[PDB]
Each structure stands twice: as C-alpha cells, then as structure tokens.
Design a protein around this ligand. Structure first.
Ligand SMILES: CCCCCCCCCO[C@@H]1O[C@H](CO)[C@@H](O)[C@@H](O)[C@H]1O
Ligand SMILES: CCCCCCCCCO[C@@H]1O[C@H](CO)[C@@H](O)[C@@H](O)[C@H]1O
Ligand SMILES: CCCCCCCCCO[C@@H]1O[C@H](CO)[C@@H](O)[C@@H](O)[C@H]1O
Ligand SMILES: CCCCCCCCCO[C@@H]1O[C@H](CO)[C@@H](O)[C@@H](O)[C@H]1O
Ligand SMILES: CCCCCCCCCO[C@@H]1O[C@H](CO)[C@@H](O)[C@@H](O)[C@H]1O
Ligand SMILES: CCCCCCCCCO[C@@H]1O[C@H](CO)[C@@H](O)[C@@H](O)[C@H]1O
Ligand SMILES: CCCCCCCCCO[C@@H]1O[C@H](CO)[C@@H](O)[C@@H](O)[C@H]1O
Ligand SMILES: CCCCCCCCCO[C@@H]1O[C@H](CO)[C@@H](O)[C@@H](O)[C@H]1O
Ligand SMILES: CCCCCCCCCO[C@@H]1O[C@H](CO)[C@@H](O)[C@@H](O)[C@H]1O
Ligand SMILES: CCCCCCCCCO[C@@H]1O[C@H](CO)[C@@H](O)[C@@H](O)[C@H]1O
Ligand SMILES: CCCCCCCCCO[C@@H]1O[C@H](CO)[C@@H](O)[C@@H](O)[C@H]1O
Ligand SMILES: CCCCCCCCCO[C@@H]1O[C@H](CO)[C@@H](O)[C@@H](O)[C@H]1O
Ligand SMILES: CCCCCCCCCO[C@@H]1O[C@H](CO)[C@@H](O)[C@@H](O)[C@H]1O
Ligand SMILES: CCCCCCCCCO[C@@H]1O[C@H](CO)[C@@H](O)[C@@H](O)[C@H]1O
Ligand SMILES: CCCCCCCCCO[C@@H]1O[C@H](CO)[C@@H](O)[C@@H](O)[C@H]1O
Ligand SMILES: CCCCCCCCCO[C@@H]1O[C@H](CO)[C@@H](O)[C@@H](O)[C@H]1O
Lengths: 251, 256, 252, 253
C-alpha cells in the first residue's frame, strides 16, 4: 500500500526528529545546564532536522511537518484527501517520541523534580516536550514570529526541493536545511523557540497533558497552545505563494 | 504572463531578496542576544549566525555567481569588468533599500522583546543601548584610523576570497558548496578581527539600518556616536574592495 | 590474505579515535574547564570519529567499534570467526591509546590530582579514560540509554554503507557520521556519556585498573562497567534487525 | 616572475601571512576584550579556520608548505630539494614576523586600552601570548616536548596521507577543510599544555617580533626557556611522523 509506505516514512522521521530535539532540552534542563544550554538546544535541534530528513528519504521524501504537507497540497504534489492522514501520522509520531523521551530521561527527570511535574516555575519540565513563549511575548508578536520563521523555512525547502534550481548538491540537502534551522534558531528562536511545525508542538503538548503535567499545558502563556499550530500553517501558505510567485517571475 | 523579461529587473530582485535574508538573520541574532540578557545568544552566537546568514543569503542569491549583496563586491565586479559601471548605483541603492526594509522587519519581529528590554528607551550608547542591533558601532577605545584600517583589511580579505572562489582559472571548491566556504570565511573574520567594530564589511548592511534607526526612534545620535563613526563602514569597505581587487589582479598577473 | 592489514586499520583508527576523545576530556577536567567543557568534549568526540573513520578508510573500511563489527557479522559482511580478532585488536588499541593520553597529560594529571588517582570525588580522573553514569542513573535507565544510542548509530552506519541507498557524496561519509555523533552527544549524552563502543570503554577502564586507579573502576556506579560493554552490543543487534526489517519491507 | 623559486617563496609568504593574521587576531580579540569577544574555544576554532584558509591561499595541500615541519617532511620524502629547505624556512619565519606587526597595528588601540602601554610576558595583563605560545604553568619542558612531537607527528601523518594521491580520502577542493577539522580536534584534545603551535615559524617568528617590538628578552626566558621546544619538537614530530607514514604505506604494499 503506497499510503502505508508514505505513512511509515512520516512516522519514522518525525520520531527521530522529536527524540533528538526533546532529548537535547531534557539534557540541558535536567543537568542544571552542565551538559547542555540554549546553544546546544538550538544546535541539536538543527542536527535533528538534518538527520530526520535523511531518515525520511531527503527533502523529496517525507514531509515531517504539517506545514510542509500543506505546502505540498498547495503546489499539487500531495492530494488534499491525504493531508489529514499525514498530519494525523505526524502528530501520533510526535506523541510517541515524547513517550520515548520520557523513558530515556526517566531517572534524570525524577532526580530533577522529585516527581513534581510543572509547566511554569523554576523546576518546570513541560518545555522539554513542547514550546512556551518568552514571558514578555504577546500572542500577536508570537503569531508573527512563527509566520515569518515558518515561511522562511518553507521557501527554503521548496527551493531545495525544486529540481530546476541549481542549489545544493545531491545528498547534502538535509545538511543545508540543518544550517537554515540553526540560523533561524539563533536569529529568531528567542521569542518562542522556533517550533516551526505544528505536529512537533501539539503532539508532545498532548503527551504532557495526559502524562502528568495536566491542563496548564493549554492555559500557560495566555493560551499559547494554538499559536504553534495555526501560525506555521499561515506561514506555509504565504511562503508557498511567495515561492510560486518568484518562480512565475522567473519563467 | 508574469515573466520579468528585463535582465536588470531580475538582477535587482535578486539583490533585494538576498540582502533581505542576510539582514534578517544577521540583525535577528544580535537582537536575540541583546534583548534576552544574553540568555539566548551572545558574542559567539552573533558571529556564527552572521556567517550562516551569508551562506544562506548567497544560496538565495544564486550562489557566488549570482547576487552581490554587498556594495563592496559590486565595486569589485565593476573593477574587474563584470558589472557595467552604470548599473553600480542601481545595485547599491537596491542593497541599501533592502537592508532598510529588513531592519523594519527585525523591529517588528522583536517589538515585544525590545520594549521589555528597554522599557521604551531607545538609546545608542550605554548599558541598555539597542542601536547596535541594526548597525555597527566601534569599541570605545577605537580611533577612526584604527577602525578604518580594520574595515579595509577585513573587507579586502573577504573580497580576495570571493574573487578566488569566482575565478574559474582556479580549481575551485566543489560545485554547490561555495556559499558554505564563504560562510567559513565570514566566521573566521568575525573571530579574528570582529572585536574592533563588529565586522560589517558591507556598506549597505550598515548604512541602511543606521538610517532605519535614525527615523524609527533612536535619533541623530546614530550618526554622531563613535566620533562620527557612521561613514567608516561606508568608505572603508569600498577602499578595502579596491585594494583587495587590485591585489588579487596583480597576483594573478605575476603568475602569468 | 588481508587479515593483518584489516587488523592494522582497526588499530590505527581506534588509536586516533581514543587519543582525540580522551584528550578532550583530560583537557577539560585538567584545566579546571578553562580549556574545555562539556560542549568541547562532545564536539571533540565528534571530530574524533570523523578523523578516525577517514584514517580507517571511510565507513566501508575499519570498524573501530565491537558493536559495528557485530553488525557486520549479522548482515554477513564480516565472517563470524574474525569477530574475536577485531574486538581484541580494538580493545588493545583503546588500552594503548589510554597509555598515550596518560603520558600526554602526565604533568597536568599530577597538577590536578597531586598524585591522588581516584574514581568518584571532586578530583576524580578515572572518567578521562572510561565512562561513568550520572549519580542518579539506574542500571536499567543506563542500559536503555546505550541500547538506543548505539542502535541509532548503527542504523545510521548501515544506511550510509548500504549501496541501495542514494548515499552521501563520496568522501563526506565520515563528516556526516561525525554530525550524528554530535547529535547523539547533545541529545542523549547526559546519562552516561555516549560510549556507544565497548572497546572505547572497557579498553581504557582496564588501563586505569592497572595504571593506578584500582578496582574502584569496576565497582563504581553500582558495578557500571559491564553496561557500556553489553548495552551497545544489544543496540547493534536491535538496530541491525530493525534496519533489515525496514528494507525487507520495501522489497518483494 | 619567471623564477620558480621566486613564485614558491611568494606562495609561502602569502600563506603564512594569512595564517598568522587570523591566528593571532583571534587571541588579540579574546585577550583585549577581556574575553567578551572571544575565549579559549574561539581561539581554537579560529586557529583551525586560519589553517584551512591559509592552505587555500597557498594552493591547497600540494601547494605551499606554510610550516618548517612540513617542509622537512617534504625534504625527507624527496618532494623538496634539501638545499631549498633553509630558504623556505626563512621565508615562513619572516612572513610570521611581518604578520605579527600587522596584528600589532590592527589591534593597536585595543592593545593600548588593555595594557595601558605596559607590554609584559607574564602576569595578569601579559600580551606576549597574542603573538607566540607559552606553556601551561604546570608543564615541564619534557612533557611539552612530547606534546608537540605527538601533535605535530599526527598532523604530518594526516597531511602526507592527504597528499598521497594513492589514498581515497577527502573530495577534491575540500582537503583544507578536513585539515582544519584536524587542527580543531588537536586544539580541543591536545591544546591545553601549550596551545598547538605545531609550527616552528608560527612560534619563533612572532616571538622574535615581540622581542624587538617592546616585550623584551623575557619572551625567551619565560617558561623555563620554553622558546626552543616549539622550534625543535615539531621538527622531531615531522621526522617521526614521516617515518611512521612511510612504515604504514610499506606495511600495506
Ligand atoms: C538513525 C540515523 C540515520 C538513519 C538514516 C536512514 C537513511 C535511509 C532512509 O531511506 C529512506 O527511508 C525511508 C523510510 O523512512 C523510505 O521511505 C525509503 O524510501 C528510503 O529511501
Ligand atoms: C487535539 C486537538 C485538541 C486540542 C485542544 C486543546 C485546547 C483546549 C482549550 O484549552 C484552553 O485553551 C484556551 C485558549 O483557547 C486557554 O485559555 C486555556 O484556558 C485552555 O484551557
Ligand atoms: C530562495 C528564494 C529564491 C527562490 C526563487 C526561485 C526562482 C527560480 C529561478 O529559476 C530559474 O530562473 C532563471 C532566471 O532567473 C531561469 O533562467 C531558469 O534557470 C530558471 O530555472
Ligand atoms: C536555503 C538554500 C536554498 C538553495 C537554493 C536556493 C536558490 C535557488 C534559486 O536561486 C536563484 O534565485 C535568484 C533570486 O534570488 C534568481 O536570480 C534565480 O536566478 C535563482 O537561480
Ligand atoms: C575558507 C575559504 C577560503 C577561500 C577558498 C579559496 C577558493 C579557491 C579554490 O580554488 C582552488 O582550490 C583548489 C583545490 O582543488 C586548490 O588547489 C587551490 O589551488 C585553489 O586554486
Ligand atoms: C542620506 C545618507 C547619508 C546618511 C547621513 C549623512 C551624514 C549624517 C552626518 O551626521 C553627522 O556626521 C558628522 C560627520 O562624521 C558627525 O561628526 C556628526 O556631526 C553627525 O551628526
Ligand atoms: C590569498 C590568495 C590570493 C592570491 C591569489 C593568487 C592567484 C595566483 C594566480 O593564479 C594561478 O596562476 C597560475 C599561473 O598563472 C596558474 O597555474 C594557477 O595555478 C592559478 O591558480
Ligand atoms: C586528517 C585525516 C586525513 C585522512 C586522509 C585520507 C586517509 C587515508 C586512509 O587510508 C587508509 O588507511 C587505512 C589504514 O588505516 C588502510 O586500510 C588503507 O586501506 C587506506 O585506504
Ligand atoms: C557473548 C556474545 C557476544 C558476541 C555475540 C556472539 C555471536 C555468536 C554468533 O555465533 C554464530 O551464530 C551464527 C548465527 O547465529 C551462526 O551462523 C554461527 O556462525 C555462529 O558462529
Ligand atoms: C544490510 C545492508 C548491508 C550492506 C553491507 C555491505 C556494504 C558494502 C561494502 O561496501 C564496499 O566496501 C568495499 C570494501 O569492502 C569498498 O571498497 C567499496 O567498494 C564499498 O562499496
Ligand atoms: C547526520 C545524518 C546521518 C544519516 C545519513 C543517512 C544515510 C544517507 C544515505 O544516503 C541517502 O540515502 C537516502 C536513502 O536513499 C536518500 O534519501 C538520499 O537523500 C541520500 O542522501
Ligand atoms: C590486566 C587486566 C586484568 C583483568 C582485570 C579483571 C579483574 C577485576 C577484579 O576486581 C576485583 O574486584 C574486587 C571487588 O570484590 C576487588 O576488591 C578486588 O578483589 C579486585 O581484584
Ligand atoms: C575482560 C573483562 C574483565 C572485567 C572484570 C571486572 C571485574 C568485575 C567487577 O567487580 C565487581 O563487579 C560487581 C558487579 O558488576 C560490582 O558490584 C563490584 O563489586 C565490582 O568490584
Ligand atoms: C582570504 C583570502 C583567501 C584567498 C584564497 C585564494 C586561493 C587561490 C590561491 O591560489 C594559488 O595561489 C598561490 C599563491 O599563494 C599560487 O602559487 C598559485 O599557484 C595558485 O594556485
Ligand atoms: C593516517 C592514514 C594512514 C595512512 C595509510 C596509508 C597506507 C595505505 C595505502 O594504500 C591505500 O589503499 C590502496 C592502496 O593500498 C589505495 O586506496 C591507496 O590510495 C590507499 O588508500
Ligand atoms: C634563529 C633565531 C634564534 C632565536 C633564539 C636565540 C636567543 C636564545 C634565547 O636566549 C636564552 O635562551 C636560553 C636557552 O633556553 C634561555 O635560558 C633564556 O634565558 C634566553 O635568554
């Protein structure tokens, strides 16, 4: 079954993406920042994307991201009827990787918290799994952040995926994508941590909702949960339109 | 039916796109470090991000063969006869405009963080100054002379490298990796000669955003600060590109 | 017959691997973290794998790791009867490279330790050579940690080596492996370092046993020493069986 | 320039000059900023970037040598005439001396601000080590000599292996990048004892600069007379490294 094969690729790639991304936050948090910090988190996040894109068969393979799946539907490369299935698989995979992360870091989490799982405050561990905005950040500014960041990402991915573009060399495309993730992380990561990917954010938030952290994962940050869902989708639409226009202006 | 037939228009669009990306990533990383109280960025993160921005922007621009992104490089391309002189004012203006616009986007991207960091007080010098998010300012100890030399050298070295990567009489680095190697050059320059004044090496990258901060809340001190520093990142890199290009060219002439 | 050349490549590669890896820990610990830290240790271990793999003739050359050698047997690329030879050579090279590190950092060890060679305290230097778990880590968590990390490394190496995949540009395979090791170190290095390699751990632990640290190197961490030996082997087996199942799933 | 030796000397001067500007530049950036613009990691990283840039400048690994130790290796394998060895070393030495003056000028204002004009070799505000290397205070001469024999021997074996057109190694056009990875690995694993000068010209030439440029004879007496270890020990490392490389090739063929 082709759909099944496509679904396997999404599940595998999102799983590896999420393990490495979340593991790097758990490493920094539960170690008191003696084995990780903000830079380590951004770098491991960009290496996670490089590796996951390889796992998924490169940029032309798995999407790993509802935002990118939307972009593929817009340009005609993925049938609209398959979009919910992809997003479902990507969400489930991120949910499952959060469980793997929880088990990988069980002793470290227990040691750091004494078993007290919190969303805010000095020992909070909710942000190992999903993102939370900086304390100063309004919903509007956060929405803008993650329209711009995701639209930049999407235009970069589409230009790499576009075979008529002379860009990066065969077999290195995931490495350059990793470079862009790093650049975005270090230049646009301060407001709310470049989730850039609604499955990357909602799947794990749901995991922490049911695995001990409770409803505050949805009320925290002024109801922040829906911004990493909606804004990347807006960013993918605007980014796909921008890219399609640029192509039209060029030939 | 939307195809741009004019070559000049296509070239201008590339300048605009590449400079815009270069400047968003470059200024964003300074803003991230500054506004976060250095908990989300720092000097190293700024130097690394600025060299990543160059790599990414040169890909966006069509590799080193495509967009210039830099009035100093555009001068070099004229000097070696690859850009008609008459197009040079057009390129520089589009570069300036793109950098100005990208500063606007940075300002909107970091509005809440700026307000929180400054309480609304937009200063150019002092513990909480934020003008250096957009344009570059010299260390307090630096004279114009030393600052001038610093930018002549940094920019001259950059241009010579770009010329060597471009020159097809050389063996060249692998196709599709030029931008990565340019990025590595930018990183090296930032860690070895970025202390005096933040290595702008690009008049558009500096003046455009300085003009933005002039009108967007920082006032005329952006032009008086540093003993009238604003003109050094304009003139010195152009002097550096001229000396670098002349140096590259006789070296080549010297081996023929 | 290429057995002797195959052994030489294992010995050379492991030796560069261990010098660079251990040196970076010694540089960090011994300088009071003024010339190294957790991050340079993880990055140095990445560079070391990249350099050692070039030295060993790239991913299809020296194995450098009992867990990869085990994977080569399972998939039928290394004869089972050579597995004990490769592991022995890998173990011996890691033991010798620890001697080289000790000599390299002789004055710095004495300055850091005043001659007191311990495992566990504030001036402990045993973890320059072999890996010890975080104080909170149970043997269960540490075992799972190594099984997962090594399994991920091995799936990555299999996919790079497998010529049915489109591949990574020729002569950059080692650089991409190094990026995986960096990713593993930053995302799952906190529990017990990322030995990922039985010879890289047991070889040097044997060295510290006889070179001055004593039997504590085997009782510390609730008898930690066997976990970096057995867990990467289980990870190699589980990763290999997973790579082969996925693959078979895409064939008839 | 019709003279072959002339063009070869020019290549050595230009390569070493860039190597030194970038290498010393990063130490001045870290020291004179009070480590707000650089630190130990930055110095190691910029050192490794300087080498790959300078090796490009020189025409890749099969171009300029940039290093008395590597030229000795080239003489031993017959790829460079012995009678040209004192010439190469002298040009490498003088390039490093000239590059140190460029560093002093580039960082003139930063140096005055940091020292108040008192140039010292030891103590809280010493600036001598911007230009040349000094050993960790705990290090004996013997241990530093071993440190530089091993570090340089490993560098030389890597470089010979890359030069050796019989080896499948790095993609054409990226050999200087992999050498720079090597220099970073060496800096992070073996840079604590005395930096990783690995290069007699990189060390002596700058030391002679600071000697005449205001730091005085103490650059030669500091570190229990340390100055000759980064001169002699890389030469022994190159010799040992070259024999080792030749042994290993023979062991395969
Ligand atoms: C664990 C660290 C590195 C693992 C790297 C795996 C690289 C090989 C992946 O190839 C792709 O796998 C997809 C499944 O996801 C399939 O759809 C298939 O088409 C194939 O082309
Ligand atoms: C799998 C899709 C289902 C996800 C739905 C989870 C969101 C449930 C709504 O939670 C509420 O969100 C408000 C913001 O609207 C917050 O103010 C807060 O009070 C919170 O209680
Ligand atoms: C990262 C943002 C940049 C995305 C821009 C996508 C534009 C695609 C350009 O296509 C190329 O345009 C040339 C003319 O310019 C043509 O001759 C032809 O070669 C065509 O294939
Ligand atoms: C993040 C890395 C992205 C790699 C590939 C992006 C570049 C692909 C298109 O580039 C170039 O767009 C220029 C406009 O800027 C045009 O002039 C056009 O001729 C085109 O060729
Ligand atoms: C780190 C950035 C430094 C700038 C890179 C310089 C690019 C010039 C590439 O051309 C050639 O690369 C060849 C490899 O084959 C070498 O032989 C060398 O002769 C040179 O002619
Ligand atoms: C429209 C593009 C040009 C941008 C701004 C033009 C120059 C602004 C000049 O400002 C003045 O420059 C003097 C010279 O350094 C300083 O001493 C100080 O008096 C400053 O107030
Ligand atoms: C920092 C480095 C910048 C200086 C650039 C020096 C360029 C040297 C001139 O080119 C060289 O001319 C040789 C003979 O004319 C050719 O055989 C070929 O080798 C070519 O590469
Ligand atoms: C700084 C790293 C530079 C490395 C440049 C290339 C290294 C070449 C390694 O050669 C390999 O040596 C193996 C012995 O270990 C042998 O098995 C042999 O087959 C050979 O292929
Ligand atoms: C203590 C365990 C640590 C290393 C693992 C040892 C693996 C032993 C495998 O033996 C081999 O099994 C093959 C298939 O099972 C058989 O074909 C046969 O060739 C036999 O020789
Ligand atoms: C489950 C997938 C198993 C795939 C394992 C087989 C890997 C193929 C080995 O590669 C080959 O190794 C040679 C040396 O042995 C090299 O010289 C080169 O020719 C290379 O192509
Ligand atoms: C740091 C990440 C390390 C993982 C490297 C993963 C294996 C790379 C093998 O080559 C890749 O094979 C894929 C499967 O065919 C293709 O999709 C193609 O794009 C190609 O590049
Ligand atoms: C050259 C390598 C030799 C192989 C090393 C394996 C021997 C390890 C045994 O440790 C023993 O653990 C005891 C705990 O009961 C200690 O009290 C003491 O008896 C010690 O001897
Ligand atoms: C060639 C491999 C030989 C290595 C043998 C190591 C000796 C075994 C370690 O001794 C004991 O292990 C116990 C449980 O593991 C610990 O609780 C502790 O009491 C320790 O002293
Ligand atoms: C920061 C500046 C980066 C410039 C990189 C320049 C790389 C091109 C240098 O090519 C080589 O120049 C040698 C002179 O040194 C000559 O011998 C000649 O044979 C040529 O092949
Ligand atoms: C630090 C690296 C150690 C150097 C080891 C080099 C000796 C191996 C030489 O033979 C290797 O094998 C084949 C011929 O033997 C070819 O592939 C050849 O080009 C080389 O690869
Ligand atoms: C080719 C140029 C050679 C440069 C070196 C020549 C000067 C030697 C330095 O003099 C003395 O060296 C003694 C030997 O260690 C030290 O004890 C120390 O007191 C120092 O004063």
């Amino acid at each position: 079954s082709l759909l099944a094969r496509q679904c396997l690729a999404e599940f595998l790639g999102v799983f590896v993406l999420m393990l490495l991304t979340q593991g790097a936050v758990a490493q920094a948090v539960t170690s008191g920042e003696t084995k990780g910090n903000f830079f380590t988190m951004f770098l491991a996040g960009s290496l996670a994307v490089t590796i996951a894109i390889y796992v998924g068969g490169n940029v032309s393979g798995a999407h790993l991201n509802p935002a990118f799946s939307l972009a593929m539907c817009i340009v005609g490369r993925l049938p609209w009827v398959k979009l919910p299935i992809y997003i479902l698989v990507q969400l489930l995979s991120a949910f499952c990787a959060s469980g793997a992360t929880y088990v990988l870091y069980h002793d470290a989490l227990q040691n750091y918290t004494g078993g007290n799982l919190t969303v805010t405050g000095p020992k909070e561990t909710a942000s190992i799994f999903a993102t939370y905005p900086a304390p100063y950040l309004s919903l509007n500014n956060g929405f803008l952040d993650q329209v711009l960041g995701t639209g930049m990402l999407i235009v970069g991915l589409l230009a790499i995926l576009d075979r008529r573009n002379k860009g990066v060399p065969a077999g290195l495309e995931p490495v350059v994508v990793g470079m862009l993730i790093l650049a975005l992380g270090l230049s646009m990561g301060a407001n709310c941590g470049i989730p850039l990917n609604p499955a990357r954010d909602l799947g794990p938030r749901l995991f922490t909702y049911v695995a001990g952290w409770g409803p505050e994962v949805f009320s925290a940050g002024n109801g922040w949960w829906w911004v990493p869902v909606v804004a990347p989708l807006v960013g993918a639409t605007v980014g796909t339109a921008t890219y399609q226009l640029l192509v039209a202006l060029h030939h």
